[PDB]
Design a protein around this nucleic acid. Sequence first.
DNA 1: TGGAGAATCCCGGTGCCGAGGCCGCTCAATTGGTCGTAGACAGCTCTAGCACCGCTTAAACGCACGTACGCGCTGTCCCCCGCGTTTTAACCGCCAAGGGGATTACTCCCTAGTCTCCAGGCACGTGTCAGATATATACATCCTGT
DNA 2: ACAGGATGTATATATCTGACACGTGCCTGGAGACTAGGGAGTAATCCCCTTGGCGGTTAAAACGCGGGGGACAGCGCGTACGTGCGTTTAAGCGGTGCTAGAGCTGTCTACGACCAATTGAGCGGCCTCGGCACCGGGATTCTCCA
Lengths: 201, 83, 82, 97, 97, 92, 92, 109, 109
Amino acid sequence: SCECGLEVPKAATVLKTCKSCRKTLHGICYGNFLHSSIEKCFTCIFGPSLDTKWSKFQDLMMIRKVFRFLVRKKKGFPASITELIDSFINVEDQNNEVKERVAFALFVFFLDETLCLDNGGKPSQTIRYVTSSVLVDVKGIVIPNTRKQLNVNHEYKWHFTTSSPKAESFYQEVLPNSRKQVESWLQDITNLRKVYSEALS
Amino acid sequence: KVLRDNIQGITKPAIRRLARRGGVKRISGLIYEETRGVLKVFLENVIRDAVTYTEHAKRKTVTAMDVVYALKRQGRTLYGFGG
Amino acid sequence: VLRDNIQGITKPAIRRLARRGGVKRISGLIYEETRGVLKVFLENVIRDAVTYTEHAKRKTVTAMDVVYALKRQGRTLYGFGG
Amino acid sequence: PHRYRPGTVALREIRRYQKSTELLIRKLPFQRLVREIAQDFKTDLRFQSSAVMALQEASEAYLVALFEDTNLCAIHAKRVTIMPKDIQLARRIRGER
Amino acid sequence: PHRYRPGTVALREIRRYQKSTELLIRKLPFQRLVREIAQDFKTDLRFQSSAVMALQEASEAYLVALFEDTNLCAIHAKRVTIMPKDIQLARRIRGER
Amino acid sequence: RKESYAIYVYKVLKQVHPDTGISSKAMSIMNSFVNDVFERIAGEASRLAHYNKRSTITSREIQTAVRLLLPGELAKHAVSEGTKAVTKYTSA
Amino acid sequence: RKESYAIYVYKVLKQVHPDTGISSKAMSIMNSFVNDVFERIAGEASRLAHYNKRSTITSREIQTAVRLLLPGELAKHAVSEGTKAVTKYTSA
Amino acid sequence: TRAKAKTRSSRAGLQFPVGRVHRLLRKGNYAERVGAGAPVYLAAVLEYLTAEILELAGNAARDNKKTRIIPRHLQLAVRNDEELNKLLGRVTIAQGGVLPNIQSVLLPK
Amino acid sequence: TRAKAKTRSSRAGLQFPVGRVHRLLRKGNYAERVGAGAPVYLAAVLEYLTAEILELAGNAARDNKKTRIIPRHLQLAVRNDEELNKLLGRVTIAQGGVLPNIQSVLLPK
DNA sequence: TGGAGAATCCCGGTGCCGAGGCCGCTCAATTGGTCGTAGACAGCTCTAGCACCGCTTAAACGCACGTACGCGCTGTCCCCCGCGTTTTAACCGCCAAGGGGATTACTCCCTAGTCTCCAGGCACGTGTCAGATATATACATCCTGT
DNA sequence: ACAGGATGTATATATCTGACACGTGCCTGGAGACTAGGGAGTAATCCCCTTGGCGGTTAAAACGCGGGGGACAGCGCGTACGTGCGTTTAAGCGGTGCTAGAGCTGTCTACGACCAATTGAGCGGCCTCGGCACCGGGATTCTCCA
Ligand SMILES: [Zn+2]
Ligand SMILES: [Zn+2]
């Protein structure tokens, strides 16, 4: 029923509801709102021209899903990427396309300094960070600045934070407001896709 | 808003029902005024101890367990509400 | 074997206890009932005192055994050890 | 008309209220009394719903037991009605006063 | 002859015994009573000298306090003498019976 | 994760009356009853060791504390039940 | 070797009434009074830590237990005496 | 290798737990050390008292023609019995009520 | 080297021992750990209550023209005061006696 | 002693919400082995509990006498109970905004453990003064007749 | 409403004596100086529960009035209890004599604490049906006045 179109395990999220159309919604897809009732959802705000099958919309949903899941878990990054994928995605729905989308989301997170690599200590002396050891198992992860791939079957120390000084607004705000904001977010997604494509090849 | 003069909420018919369960057949006319005084003293002692437990735990809400502990200290154990 | 020692608590002795309480005039049937009340009181205290003695594997009742027994029932006593 | 003689209805109510287990005081007026008393000790306090119910259960049990001792004192003086001096004697012997 | 009127000497003894702190029961008869009771629980027991004295101190304090409550019940019924039914009422209210 | 005696109380009920149930409100009262008696016996046994200058709580402390608390024939039957269980446990 | 508070009680007496003595029987009663109050306060403070799931007894537990036991103005004066001593000890 | 696992309750023929009771004694600030036979003795006593109350409560429910036990039935069992009444002499049971009792002098003549 | 030795009581200006009280708390099965300021707070409270009783007892002895305190004088001080009477409400003092009190109705008229 | 009449009890038909049973999994109970100290057991020393006898005098015991307190009966009148009307506030649904309790990693200070050593507190003598014990005296209170 | 006799209680003086205040010697426990690790404080985020407002329907509190019966005071009568005197009896005190059990060392072993690896029992979530509350009608019983 949700615009994401996938299924989430019960322990991962908490259900919500829209007041107008009265349909079940995912808590993580909307930023963990205070109350259990929401006035208007994406369909109510946008209108009949909202095609949920657009790739940009699905990428936006995936990014918001991952960010909210990590924030509400309050434990930093899990041990392995496959562990996260199995945690917040069912086995049946797991295909190559969602893996590519997860890789794109991780690249976007690395670009905005939300997720940072450990050189010799914590990045900032003021902003809180959480440090954990992650074993890389999937292939296709690109560090933006160094423009180099990450070796397979190796472990690295990663840092994670919530209130980054510079982060994209489409996964920072709680609820949508108007259609202009949504189309601006879609344009930003297009620009990020172009940058990822030009940096991968 | 400040509450005041709420002791009159304990009405005359309510007191007679409590006396009937005790087994009293006939009641005088001055009983009602003195009964209100006895009840007020009882509540002050219990409530004072309940708030003391709340402040030690650094909370702003009085819970059911705080009342149970206060009653047990005075020698009136209560069964049924947690504990 | 001792027997019929409850009569040692004489009539004049009971009147002296009543005078300290503040009693001016006494009936004639008070003396018999007072002996019954005292006997019940001693049985409860002495039973607990012996229980403490047996746990310690002794054959002599000490002063501290009496003090502990009284405190359990809710009558603290000051003056004898403790 | 068929008026019952005095005392007949009173005995009927004694049997009725010794057979049930409900509360005998209106809930809403009792809640306001509790909040007023607590203002002296601390201001801006909040209560749980079950916290107030615990107080009402203990309060009524205290009053019912008190009336039983009051009734015995009245009979000792060869009377039927209960009077304020009967309550005072019961509390004095019990040890509260 | 010079006989005092009834009640005059009784008031004189009340002031005398509320001014001293001595014991009011003969020591030797009291000791035999204690040993007789203890025979039921265990045989061939021995007592310390101070153990018996502790029992006598607590016993007399219990009886003196009981007579004060008995006196109040008699006055409540407009009498002066104390009667067996006054003792029974005091113990019932207190909670022993 | 909270703990209670609800599972164990229900087993005893089926031995006495095989076809009788119990409500949730009554279950809470029985749960409070067990905790209350636990503290009385355990607390009393602690003072017995302190008086005699010992550092261990054994079966003797438990047995003596029962006779001080329970009245009349309740203590007489409780002692036999406790003694019967200990000897069976030692054999096996 | 037995211990008692007899030495310390005598020092306090000389501050209040410099030329008054005390008998041996009265000394025993005062000794029992101190032990009785010690157990009431220490025992109550033990339960406060258990309720809040703590492993340490601090000044807060002692202060709260005093207000629960002592009645009326006795508690008011006792708190000031205890607070005054702690701050002086910390400075030196 | 390891030869299965038997609960300590089964070795004593009891229904109440023995391992749980042992843990509560140790983490309760009662004494420095706890013996081996102490948990077995205490568990048996608690079970005996529980069966005593439940038997009397079940009889009261049968007289009222019901198949469940409510707090009213627990009140009747305790107060009618003499030994249990003395044990729980300062305990209030919620929603219990009182026993029917009227003084004789008040009755009509 | 070591710089002399000062008792912890002297640092707080008290008369009651502080080191002894600390030992009793630790070897008493009250808690796992004991703080540093707890013994100082408890010692001050005990000293305050002791001075309260002794002052009233000394006045009673002076009224009777004696220079020593006997158990009779302790009884008068406690019972006449209102706060101390409520604290020691279930305590018996050996060789204490009672306060003089006669009901008015019994007096001659 | 008999009828009316009101209050209580007994039976059958409906429906709904709470108690009883099943399953996945995770965390707490079980099994096997090592090490150190708490308490069981034996022996000895000297304290305090028990038993008996003679003597002096204070408290317990039995009896006569009479006055004051307890108990039953009668008459007044005032205050509380029972029933019908009129009025006030408790009770039940629904909605909304916000306060405060619960969870988790990070960080640092405070308490336990160990070794050395020396003053503070306890056990044992010693003398002297506050309290105990007679005696002579002065004052206050009760009771019967005036 | 007094006068005076008779009895009980408080006051000032002079000798004894044993319990309390003080001094001395000795040793066990508290203080000084370190180190290591974990227990509790803090900030950011999630999310449910307590508080306040609005409207309608009906149960319950408030008021008035007539009688009936119980609380209260007064009076009379029979006897149980207080006061005083003479005779009898164990309590209290000072000895002597004897032995049981309390209290303290010394030796050594069986028992409880602690750790690592393994696994199954109990907790949380979910369905599902039947036990009990409610309503309507007939039958039975208890109170009241002729
Ligand atoms: Zn979704
Ligand atoms: Zn919508």
